[PDB]
Ligand binder design. Structure first.
Ligand SMILES: *[C@@H]1O[C@H](CO[C@@H]2O[C@@H](C)[C@@H](O)[C@@H](O)[C@@H]2O)[C@@H](O[C@@H]2O[C@H](CO)[C@@H](O[C@@H]3O[C@H](CO[C@@H]4O[C@H](CO)[C@@H](O)[C@H](O)[C@@H]4O[C@@H]4O[C@H](CO)[C@@H](O[C@@H]5O[C@H](CO)[C@H](O)[C@H](O)[C@H]5O)[C@H](O)[C@H]4NC(C)=O)[C@@H](O)[C@H](O[C@@H]4O[C@H](CO)[C@@H](O)[C@H](O)[C@@H]4O[C@@H]4O[C@H](CO)[C@@H](O)[C@H](O)[C@H]4NC(C)=O)[C@@H]3O)[C@H](O)[C@H]2NC(C)=O)[C@H](O)[C@H]1NC(C)=O
Ligand SMILES: *[C@@H]1O[C@H](CO[C@@H]2O[C@@H](C)[C@@H](O)[C@@H](O)[C@@H]2O)[C@@H](O[C@@H]2O[C@H](CO)[C@@H](O[C@@H]3O[C@H](CO)[C@@H](O)[C@H](O[C@@H]4O[C@H](CO)[C@@H](O)[C@H](O)[C@@H]4O[C@@H]4O[C@H](CO)[C@@H](O)[C@H](O)[C@H]4NC(C)=O)[C@@H]3O)[C@H](O)[C@H]2NC(C)=O)[C@H](O)[C@H]1NC(C)=O
Lengths: 207, 200
């Protein structure tokens, strides 16, 4: 019989006024004999009528996959509203219902710290600046680097990791030329997270 | 359905620990219950696989791999055959091919703003390694440490990897000049080991 899986919005999308956060309801193992899927969508129980449902798509394994997408207000998501996806299909004994919302824990401001390059990489002509971000919850977060107003380029970030007290931490690594460090420039680690004031905080470093 | 798994890094890098794959077969019919295995290494056949002790049973099977075989990325041909299948189904496993690259290892002391908190966060940067198979741990005065978590390896723009491991200690302790130690194990190293250490 069909199964249903229900995905939340991407963290970057929840956290950013210019993006489009969506929950996505995917149904799979839909047969040829009972191919029609019907979706109903609810926000904290009230039916909504403007998800965008995609036509069915046959998969290499000869089952249909049918997907339905609902855009969520930024503030709804963040205020714990719950999104239910109800799926019907003749091959099911009864409709299947899944519900999703932000993680339910008590929210927790992350702590941001910046870290100078290792004293021993101070020779090789590229160095590494490290941003430690920790104690945050939920794990949905967004980290960037920047120098004098401008957004940086070559940095990479670890996913959040579950810490032993139930909170999360990650690190972000940023590579610049030795000479750019040594010239006393200011680098800045930005963190966007629901529990910070104005959903944003920033820490900087140099020599 | 057929899936083929790798050994757990410390197993393959240590001359005495025992490294082991797994061909886990899922979704075997109470209709067609019989399942026959055929693992080859490099397409030549051996038989010394073991076979582990809701709606179905998902039937296991365990092999040991020569340390040298797996470090030389031997191709661990798995082959499962049921009557519910069209052909015989076949997974195929190795460590990642490519030039092995040695990790660079780096300890970092707490941030100065963190000094004002109640416990400190000692950090271990580990970068430039390939393949991603690795193993990190913390010890102080030659004694296992417990309070440490470690990020997964993250892929870097030159195809190499990195991670950081954060060990969390009592505030007072760091200040009593204690030498604390990060230990890393990886194939590309001399002795598949290296310590690096830091203190006040
Ligand atoms: C026939 O094919 C079908 C389609 O498969 C394709 O075709 C075949 C031929 C083959 O080629 C496949 O490779 C092809 O993929 C098969 O459907 C698949 O079925 C399985 C189940 O049988 C599904 O498995 C689940 O998958 C998710 C992981 O979700 C996916 O990641 C996978 C793996 O990377 C990826 O392939 C999928 O596409 C999903 O990716 C995510 O999709 C979403 C939405 O599209 C993306 O989010 C959206 O992104 C947009 C951008 O595009 C926007 O940003 C938007 O905002 C956003 O919403 C998302 O980014 C994308 N992510 C990634 C990384 O790609 C697992 O979560 C899921 O959970 C598991 O559930 C198990 C029970 O089944 C359980 O055992 C596990 O614990 C686990 O987790 C639990 O599950 C609970 C409920 O059961 C949860 O409530 C609970 O939280 C959790 N609990 C615990 C304790 O952990 C499960 O693993 C698979 O997704 C299907 N694939 C697709 C593509 O639909 C079909 O099976 C097959 N049929 C037959 C008979 O063979
Ligand atoms: C009920 O049984 C469940 C499993 O058996 C099932 O039996 C039937 C009911 C039937 O429906 C059948 O289809 C099922 O097989 C138990 O639930 C859980 O099963 C989990 C799988 O969802 C299993 O997770 C494993 O995680 C371990 C890690 O410790 C891995 O060994 C392993 O690998 C992965 O496979 C998943 C597929 O879900 C994939 O998403 C992962 O990323 C990873 O490999 C990936 O494989 C796919 C190949 O298609 C690729 O797309 C990816 O690239 C690849 N990923 C990467 C990073 O390379 C397992 O999945 C759990 O062990 C198990 N749950 C628990 C809680 O133990 C269930 O336990 C049982 N119920 C009860 C009540 O006991």
């Amino acid at each position: 019989g069909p199964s249903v899986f229900l995905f939340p919005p991407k963290p970057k999308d929840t956290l950013m006024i210019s993006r489009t956060p969506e929950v996505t309801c995917v149904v799979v193992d839909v047969s040829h004999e009972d191919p029609e899927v019907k979706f109903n969508w609810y926000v904290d129980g009230v039916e909504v009528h403007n998800a965008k449902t995609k036509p069915r798509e046959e998969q290499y394994n000869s089952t249909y996959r049918v997907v339905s997408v609902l855009t969520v207000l930024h503030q709804d998501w963040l205020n714990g509203k719950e999104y239910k996806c109800k799926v019907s299909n003749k091959a099911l004994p009864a409709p299947i219902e899944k519900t999703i919302s932000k993680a339910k824990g008590q929210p927790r401001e992350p702590q941001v710290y910046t870290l100078p390059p290792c004293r021993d990489e101070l020779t090789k002509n590229q160095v590494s600046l490290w941003c430690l971000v920790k104690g945050f919850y939920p794990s949905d977060i967004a980290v960037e680097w920047e120098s004098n107003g401008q957004p940086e380029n070559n940095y990479k970030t670890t996913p959040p990791v579950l810490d032993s007290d139930g909170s999360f931490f990650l690190y972000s690594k940023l590579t610049v030329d030795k000479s750019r460090w040594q010239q006393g420039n200011v680098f800045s680690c930005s963190v966007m997270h629901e529990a910070l004031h104005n959903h944003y905080t920033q820490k900087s470093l140099s020599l």
